[PDB]
Write a protein that binds this DNA or RNA. Structure first.
Length: 50
RNA sequence: GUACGGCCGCAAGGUUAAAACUCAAAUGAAUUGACGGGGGCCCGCACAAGCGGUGGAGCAUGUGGUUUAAUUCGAUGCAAC
RNA sequence: CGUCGUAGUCCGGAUUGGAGUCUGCAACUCGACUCCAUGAAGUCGGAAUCGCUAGUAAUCGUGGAUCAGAAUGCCACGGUG
RNA sequence: GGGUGAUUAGCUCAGCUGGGAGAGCACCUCCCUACAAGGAGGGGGUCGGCGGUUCGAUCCCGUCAUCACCCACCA
RNA sequence: CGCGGGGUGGAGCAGCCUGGUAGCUCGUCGGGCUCAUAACCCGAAGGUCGUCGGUUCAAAUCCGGCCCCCGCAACCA
RNA sequence: CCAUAGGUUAAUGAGGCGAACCGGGGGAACUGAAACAUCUAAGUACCCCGAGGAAAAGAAAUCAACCGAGAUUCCCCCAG
RNA sequence: UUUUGUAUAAUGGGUCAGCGACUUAUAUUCUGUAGCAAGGUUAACCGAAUAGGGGAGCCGAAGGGAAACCGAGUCUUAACU
RNA sequence: AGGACCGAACCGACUAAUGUUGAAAAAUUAGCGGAUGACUUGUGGCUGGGGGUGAAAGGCCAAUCAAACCGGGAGAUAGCUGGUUCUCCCCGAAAGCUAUUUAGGUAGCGCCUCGUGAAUUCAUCUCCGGGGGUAGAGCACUGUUUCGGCAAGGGGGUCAUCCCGACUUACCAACCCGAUGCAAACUGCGAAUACCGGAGAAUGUUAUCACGGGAGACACACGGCGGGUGCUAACGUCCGUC
RNA sequence: UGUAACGGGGCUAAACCAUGCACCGAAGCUGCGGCAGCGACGCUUAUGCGUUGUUGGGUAGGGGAGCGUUCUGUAAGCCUG
RNA sequence: GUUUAUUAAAAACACAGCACUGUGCAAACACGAAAGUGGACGUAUACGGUGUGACGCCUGCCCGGUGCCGGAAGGUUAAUUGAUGGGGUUAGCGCAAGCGAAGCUCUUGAUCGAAGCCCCGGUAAACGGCGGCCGUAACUAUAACGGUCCUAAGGUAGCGA
RNA sequence: UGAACUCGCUGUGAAGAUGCAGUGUACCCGCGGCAAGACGGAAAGACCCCGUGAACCUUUACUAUAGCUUGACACUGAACAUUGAGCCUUGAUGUGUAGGAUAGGUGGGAGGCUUUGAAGUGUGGACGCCAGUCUGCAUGGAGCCGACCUUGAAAUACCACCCUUUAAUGUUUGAUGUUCUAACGUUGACCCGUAAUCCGGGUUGCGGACAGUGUCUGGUGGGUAGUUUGACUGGGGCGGUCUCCUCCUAAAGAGUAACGGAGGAGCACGAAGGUUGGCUAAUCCUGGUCGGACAUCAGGAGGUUAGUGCAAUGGCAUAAGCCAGCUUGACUGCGAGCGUGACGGCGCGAGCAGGUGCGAAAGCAGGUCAUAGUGAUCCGGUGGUUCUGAAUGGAAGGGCCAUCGCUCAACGGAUAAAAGGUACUCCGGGGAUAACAGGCUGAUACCGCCCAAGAGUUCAUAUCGACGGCGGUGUUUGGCACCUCGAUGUCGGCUCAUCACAUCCUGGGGCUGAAGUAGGUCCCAAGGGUAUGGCUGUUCGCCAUUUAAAGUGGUACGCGAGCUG
RNA sequence: GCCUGGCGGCCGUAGCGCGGUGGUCCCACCUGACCCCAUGCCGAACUCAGAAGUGAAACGCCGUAGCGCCGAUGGUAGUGUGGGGUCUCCCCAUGCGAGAGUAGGGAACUGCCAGGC
């Protein structure tokens, strides 16, 4: 809600970028959670946003 | 040196100019103090600047204020506590 | 000489009871001196301002007056300067 | 008549969580000095009428009395 | 009609919005300068923050009630 | 100065009028979009000019698609 | 005629007479009906102008999927289902 | 002499009367306003529509003007007011639930019917049963409130900050408890009826389903009962049910 | 406006009431004369009949018939000076 | 004097007078597709315009807004020009999809560059506008005076229901 | 000019009846006069509302443009300076600075060069911070240098090489400023047309590279054009309302009304999410130094009363409330499937393929206790992609799959997107919508009674009267919409009626707080009679005064085919 | 037959209070712990090695009704369907109908299994 979008990059080759809207108004720390992508199907590591 | 009309003037104003009401002055010449917020001569540490301060703490002793049944009068900077 | 600090202190002992000591109708209230105990304030201090020129300022003891019984106030004395 | 306020000393007006009356001026007395002015002490209270409550109404409720103000035909 | 503000030790307003929290210039009394009051510099005392509550860990502010004020204003059968 | 503007004359053409279509210039509004401004209505209505039996178009700087067609125009399809 | 509603003063009617409104195209589709039937049809053209000639075109018997592609199946999909 | 006063010609309208199917789409009378002037008048010319002309009125421009007169576009446009013409039979509606750039426009669903097919179709009643949460009832619980009991808290009054503060009061008043209660937004609880399903007894000039053609319909009136609403007024307004 | 608030006349039980019995009163109930239409049962037909039941107020709308008239044909006809 | 021909006859409009201002002449200005006219056969005591209204008293403030007069440093900024980056093609590289120079070529838009705009003084006989609250003087009262909030100014003079 | 044979009244009444109900009354008809009625006659009515009407008018509504104006460009040339930018030809810049020492900078560093040349003191020209450089005579005639020591970022044979500022010569260019002139002008003259009131050509004078104009472009632009100002507002309006969400109204079957009742939502949390096992409030009492004041850890009472991201509501330990460990299931494709609405739309989920997490395991995990936190279509750009890509090889382009973006919130998006004036008003609807006579109603007003604390000497009621109760008239003013806007004309002035009686006067009775006189009051009675001025439009009201008395209400608040304005 | 435990089926007539009784099988307390497991400290909690001591407490069994709980019968509120009466209420005919209260009940029911005496 009215918050800045930034997409996470994959540490490897991936066709998707997970879109984060993470609040950075009290937490400057990075978000790293792992997500599923239907191509390699062995989970993707997503990094560097907000 | 003035209200309302004359007379002049663009106008102001000039010209003509008092009364009612009312009070101890109004006015010209000189003089003793006081005194600068004048200018000069003198002076006090006033100035210059030195060594020491008060007010706060504790204690003691006076003066005022205020209340109540008493909580005294005078001093009025220096020239009173 | 011994001893001690930036600590409201070794200190101070201002305050509060209990004991007494003195003088005196009488010290409860308003007096002084003492002891076992307890125990607070003071580490410059308001706007702003005070005072004299050397034994003067600054500073520590001694004495007297008043007085039955107490001053730190009153009048004097000398030391350091 | 209605509405909004005021209604405390003669003339003008502050109060107080209901404990109790007050100042200026006047009518007086003393202090400061002959007075102004000032300080202090007094003289006089329907705190408007009548009900509700209370042991008590400046600080409450109703109903009135009076004053300043407002209401209103024509639209 | 309908709309927008103000109410803060005694006076008149900052403060509020942005939460870690009660004020300024005067006023009153008492000082400092003085022979003295002003001008001026200091010291001191006192807020139902209109006021009853709500809400919160927490305010005068958030916020409803009960009152007091102003400004725009009555520009429609 | 020769010339030429100006002036004179002759020969021929143009002018003006006409029904509709047509070529060049100028060119709406209402209407539909369920509003309304792009779009539509519509280069239509109407006005100016010119011209022909028609105007226009024309004998590929055409297309087409590596395979081919072979000036133009009008009608039917392509295709709602 | 007109509205929930009309004795209604609510609009229309002097009277006769004459007049006074669905006509008409194309494209499409359903419904009815009829020929023909997995078939049914020609446009412009021109003609023995309702016949006949003219198959370019049109609809129907195949669908599924952006599309490539596949087909009584297809797309979706990891996949029979 | 005269942007003076009188006043006929001429020019012009302050009042009263006449006239507006009047003689007339501006003329008439009786008292008049002006009358060598910024006068008035005979005659011709020049100025044209979103433009003229105007000591400048949406005045004047030939009866006409917030764009005149004539023609063309034109048979403008009108969710609106309206005009539509002999005899007859069968079946027979709707005014509810929604949306809109939406309000007398339009639209989905809803009942009626024509076609063809199926059907003891479909409903009444009984038996069996589910959601119930109204009518009503109750008061622990949520809100709320009358009268009392015990007793904090707050205002008022006094002393304090030592006791982990008491004392008091012609105010206000919580937590809890007893008596008594009200309730749509409370529940210790809780119908008659209604609805719909399961099954069955009884029955019919057909009750209905499904697919394909046409639809039609929401401006509603009056009044109880159940309630809001107004004044438990209205020939007043919103909604269930008849 | 004029009685006008028994509908009028007129009222004394012609008002009101209990219980009972009779009466008037429509297209309802009972009948007579008709038009169209229909279920059951039984027989019969390229469709009716009997026995026995039984329906017809209707706007919106849906469906399905009848009469008249213009014109052309029917019409070189038929009717007729 | 002028007027809404038929509801207004006037205080309106005009007008003597006035301020402010534009205009140096091929004037400014007006007509208007643009010439040629009109201004004017005039030339700064000549011509244009606005408003107010002859004659006598005279005629204040606010430059915040908006316009006009004047000013140019600093910043925003167009046409123009076409830096750098992406693509095609071409030389290049390799076993390949693909990568990859100049020039050609499409694209992106670096830099260049003015006025207005952001600016600042003058101008209100330029348009336009020109305040509340409270205290305070020998009963009551009022407030010349002051306190305060506040603005671009707080509306002077005169006149005043 | 429906027909008519058309009487008055009371009531009913689409609520103002000749025609309905009830009832009363009346010889018929010309003729001259008078004039209530036909909601009389003339008018597609003024005012109000409505209409996805109409014109004209305005501009902090929307958009554009002629014109004016900025710059770029050209028609448009010459020269120089002023300053650059561009630029030729020949030469030249160079020291900062320490000791010797003028080292420009910089890369290289024992090999390398001159005979048309240097040497040395003499003259002389030039650049010069005087260290030296450089031509060239007097003049002769191939050398000469460096290493180590040494300054300094850094050497000094020798070579590649870069730049400063500028004169003179050559010169591109946009401006500034003069000058010149062929362009251009003449708004001068002269010559001729013409012994022409147009201006054509020519020659001269004087200006002079501009005016003017078209393409690009910035600015401004009502002069000119085109357009709107949403829907509801129990007539119009100010304020409110428009999407989502709970409890209730809402009818013991469901959606649900009225500007109905109590409130909220446009977000929050990567943690406040997933999961294993646990845990259990709150509040109050007791007691414990530094302790104003709630402070600790333990005990007791006690509990669907704590808490739940936020609102209202329902629930609560099988905890959905909080505590420790570990974690991504805030998953991708689907799905036994099941709901709700007329539709678009929108809620739940067992399970499986792939992968994941917690757990011993069962089991659970694609977000949160839960109901709200919303925004399609079309489109400007963007990664993946042979799916496709108009002659085909590429690209660009079209699509798919990832994707960024509206407060379009008037929320289901008529459009990214729009406000005002009209008494010049016009046109069509509407009484289906307003004030107005009537009706309904009687809240309001006016008025009667019941009750009667108190007033009034005593004393309720002579004359008054509280707090309240029960009614009346239509009688003021409110409420309705039932008749009108397809004409039913308003205020004051005035000639003129008539009915009612809550009676002003007389006529009659009763009481008194009535001795007499004179007033106050009540019920009983309707016959006549019931006044004049100032200011003002005045009704009215105030002011000034009469009379035996100068009353009140009803009649479309009687009285414009009655007059006045 | 009775007892103690469990799986339960059931969870307001097994509940609240009041008075007795039991260690045998069982259980609770309890013995011990740096051993498995554990305290964000503590063997409290939960373990692990168990019987020395009890029945304190908790637990089971049993009595006792003042009550939660169970609760007739009748009536009342309420009402479907017809109708009466100047009528948002009253009255009736016919068909239904609570909650609360009263009489009264009541200190749990029941199937399977192991062990005990």
């Amino acid at each position: 809600g009215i918050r800045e979008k930034i997409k996470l990059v994959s540490s490897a080759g991936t066709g998707h970028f997970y879109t984060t809207t993470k609040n950075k108004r009290t937490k400057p720390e990075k978000l790293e959670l792992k997500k599923f992508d239907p191509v390699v199907r062995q989970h993707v590591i997503y990094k560097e946003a907000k």
